Design a protein around this ligand. Structure first.
Ligand code: Q7F
Length: 274
């Protein structure tokens, strides 16, 4: 179970946006750290919409299972606030935020080597999840967090973490699942209970497409009916202009879930480039 954090020890500051049935805020947590030192720690606060309080179990169950698996590429969740009528996840505040926003802002300065490093780190996280037979279920660029930027001055590569799963697509409304095409795989549109480890290989492909596309969203021009038909006609995403990962993207976005490659094989493929 998550550590319970008192409402009295949390300060809510600015809204940073929204997710699926969630509102996101920056805040501060007062805590006692190592050696009894008092800290005021910047935190990211995810608030489940009170109207959708029925999704709270799913909201926190996935985050909890993943937080039981500590890993350098998985986000740190400090705990939860049962802040009265609010269900709140208290998460580390990552300095540079979501990768899709970062990709759009810095597209002119991100090259293939940067993209390759990030892809390898994401694949490393996903391999760890695969070995632990833990399904994430919402891999996407918005859920990749940039801990530190590349610094060619000191040779340091960028460093990323994968964020929490969110509400499970096994419980989300059908219309939300359709809007999440092409991250949600065809078999889960067919039946959300088909959620499987193979799901994350497909979404990883879509995320690689995002990483290579300057933060564009694939198929954003298609409404939900046209996204459904895209899967019905078994289309694949267009190659990114920077097409170095196009083959890997299409190999991961395989309409046959059993044919999607293991993350170990994906990592071997990534290492074989450049
Ligand atoms: C912020 C947000 C908006 C919709 S969803 C979501 C949460 N998450 C996907 C992104 C994130 N997570 C964490 N842990 N930290 C940050 N930092 C940050 C935020 C904003 C600006 C600069 C840096 N951003």
């Amino acid at each position: 179970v998550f550590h319970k954090i008192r409402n009295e020890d949390l300060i809510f500051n600015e809204s940073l946006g929204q997710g699926t049935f969630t509102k996101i805020f920056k805040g501060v947590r007062r805590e006692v750290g190592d050696y009894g030192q008092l800290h005021e720690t910047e935190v990211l606060l995810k608030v489940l919409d009170k109207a959708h309080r029925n999704y709270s179990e799913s909201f926190f169950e996935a985050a909890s299972m993943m937080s039981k698996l500590s890993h350098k590429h998985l986000v740190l969740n400090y705990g939860v606030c049962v802040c009265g009528d609010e269900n709140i996840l208290v998460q580390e505040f990552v300095k540079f935020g979501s990768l899709d926003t970062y990709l759009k802002k810095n597209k002119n300065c991100i090259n293939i080597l940067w993209k390759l490093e990030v892809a390898k780190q994401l694949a490393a996280a996903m391999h760890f999840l695969e070995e632990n037979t833990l399904i994430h279920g919402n891999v996407c660029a918005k859920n990749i967090l940039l801990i530190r930027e590349e610094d060619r001055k000191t040779g340091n590569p960028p460093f990323i973490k994968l964020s929490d799963p969110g509400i499970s697509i096994t419980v989300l409304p059908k219309d939300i699942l359709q809007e999440r095409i092409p991250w949600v795989p065809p078999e889960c549109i067919e039946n959300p209970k088909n959620l499987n480890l193979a799901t994350d290989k497909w979404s990883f492909g879509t995320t690689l497409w995002e990483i290579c596309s300057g933060g564009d969203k694939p198929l954003s021009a298609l409404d939900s009916q046209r996204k459904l038909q895209f899967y019905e006609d078994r289309h694949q995403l267009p190659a990114p202009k920077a097409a170095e990962l196009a083959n890997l993207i299409n190999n991961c976005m395989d309409y046959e879930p059993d044919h999607r490659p293991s993350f170990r094989a994906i990592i071997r493929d990534l290492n074989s480039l450049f």
